[PDB]
Amino acid sequence: DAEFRHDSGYEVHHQKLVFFAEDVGSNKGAIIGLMVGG
Amino acid sequence: DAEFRHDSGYEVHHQKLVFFAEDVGSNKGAIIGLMVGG
Amino acid sequence: DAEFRHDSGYEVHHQKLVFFAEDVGSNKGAIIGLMVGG
Amino acid sequence: DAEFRHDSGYEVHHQKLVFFAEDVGSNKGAIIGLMVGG
Amino acid sequence: DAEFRHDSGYEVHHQKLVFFAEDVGSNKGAIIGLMVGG
Amino acid sequence: DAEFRHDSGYEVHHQKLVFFAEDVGSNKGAIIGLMVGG
Amino acid sequence: DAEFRHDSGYEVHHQKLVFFAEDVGSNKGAIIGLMVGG
Amino acid sequence: DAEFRHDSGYEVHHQKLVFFAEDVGSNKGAIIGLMVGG
Amino acid sequence: DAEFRHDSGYEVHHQKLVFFAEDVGSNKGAIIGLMVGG
Amino acid sequence: DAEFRHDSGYEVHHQKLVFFAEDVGSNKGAIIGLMVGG
Amino acid sequence: DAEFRHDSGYEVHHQKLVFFAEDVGSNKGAIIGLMVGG
Amino acid sequence: DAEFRHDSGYEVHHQKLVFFAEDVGSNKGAIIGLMVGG
């Protein structure tokens, strides 16, 4: 799960970036190419 | 699950970006190509 | 599930982008190509 | 573009799966959330 | 582009899986959240 | 681009898996969250 | 119950305030949110 | 119960304040959020 | 209960304040958040 | 301002109390008995 | 301001109390009995 | 300001109390009985 929050007060600027990310180009907890005999 | 929130106060700027993301190009918890004999 | 919220106060700007996303190009919790003998 | 082909000769089996896929949960070459001032 | 091909000769087996995939949970060459002032 | 090929001769087996994949959970050549002032 | 009384004799002044109050923003002897099983 | 009384004799002044108060922002003898099983 | 009384004789002054108060921001003898099993 | 929320899942009980309150017997931000000469 | 939240999962009990409160018998930020000569 | 949160998982009990409070019988940031000559 993800809980993202951003709260702004008094801000003066030319440029501002806020970047919040969890899974970007990811295979978390994945099973890929499994073989079981029985 | 995802809970995203953004609250603005007093903001003065030329440019501002807020980017919130969870699963971008992802296969979280996926099973791909599994083989079971019995 | 997703719960997205954005609240604006006092904002003055040339450009502003708010981008909220959960599953973009994703196969979360998917089963693809599974084979079971019995 | 896709050019998928499968030819079977002499095959004997309990189970056989052939899985050919392209762009499964994808946004290839897509523009999402773009802003140009002029 | 994809050019997928499979040819079977003399094959005998309990289970056989052939899995050919391209761009599974992908955003290849995508533009997401871009801002240009002019 | 992908050029995937598999040719079977004389094969006898309990289980056989052939897994060919490209760009699985990937953002190759993608632009995410870019800002240019002018 | 309230018994408020003010008697003026010989008084000379720019400003005079007499403030008599009882139960201002009060919940005296109140039952709020009570639960009895039997 | 309140018994408030003020008697003025010979008084000369720029400013005079008499402030008599009882139970200002109070919950005297109140039951809030009580639970009894039986 | 309150019994507040003020009597003025011969008084001459720039400023005079008489402040009589009882239970200002108080929860005297209150029950808050009580639980009994039986 | 007040933002109150309660969400129930799987609940089994003899008795349950949820009590949410902000201003109970309160004079928040109040002016009482002010005197200004000019 | 107040932001109160309660979320229930799997709960089994004889008795449960949740009590959330901010200003109970309070005079926060109040001016009471002020005198200014000019 | 106050931000109160309670999240329940797997709970089994005879009795449970959660009590969250900020200002109970309080005069935070209050001015009471001030006198200024000018």
Numbering used by the authors:
A (entry chain F), B (entry chain F), C (entry chain F), D (entry chain A), E (entry chain A), F (entry chain A), ...: 1 to 38
Publication text:
We used electron cryo-microscopy (cryo-EM) to determine the structures of Aβ40 filaments from the leptomeninges of individuals with Alzheimer’s disease and cerebral amyloid angiopathy. Filaments are made of pairs of protofilaments, the ordered core of which comprises D1–G38. The different filament types comprise one, two or three protofilament pairs. The ordered core of each protofilament consists of residues D1–G38 and comprises four β-strands (β1–β4) that extend from residues 2–8, 10–13, 15–22 and 34–36, respectively.
There were two main types of filaments, the minority type (type 1) comprising a pair of identical protofilaments and the majority type (type 2) comprising two protofilament pairs running side by side. Type 2 filaments comprise two pairs of protofilaments that pack against each other with C2 symmetry. Pairs of leptomeningeal Aβ40 protofilaments interact through salt bridges between E3 from one dimer and R5 from the other dimer, and vice versa. A similar association of dimeric filaments into tetramers via electrostatic interactions of the surface residues K16 and E22 was observed in Aβ42 Type 1b filaments. Structures from case 1 reached the highest resolution. The structure of filaments made of two pairs of protofilaments were determined at 2.4 Å; the structure of filaments made of one pair of protofilaments was determined at 2.7 Å. All filaments had a right-handed twist, as established from the densities for backbone oxygen atoms in the cryo-EM maps. The same differences were also present when comparing the previously reported structure of type 1 filaments with the pairs of protofilaments in our 2.4 Å structure of type 2 filaments (not shown). Cryo-EM structures of type 1 and type 2 filaments, at 3.1 Å and 2.7 Å resolution, respectively, revealed the same Aβ40 fold as observed using sarkosyl extraction. There was a strong density in front of Y10, which was situated at a right angle turn between β1 and β2, which may correspond to a post-translational modification of this residue and/or an external cofactor. There was another strong density opposite a hydrophobic patch made of I31, L34 and V36 in the C-terminal region.
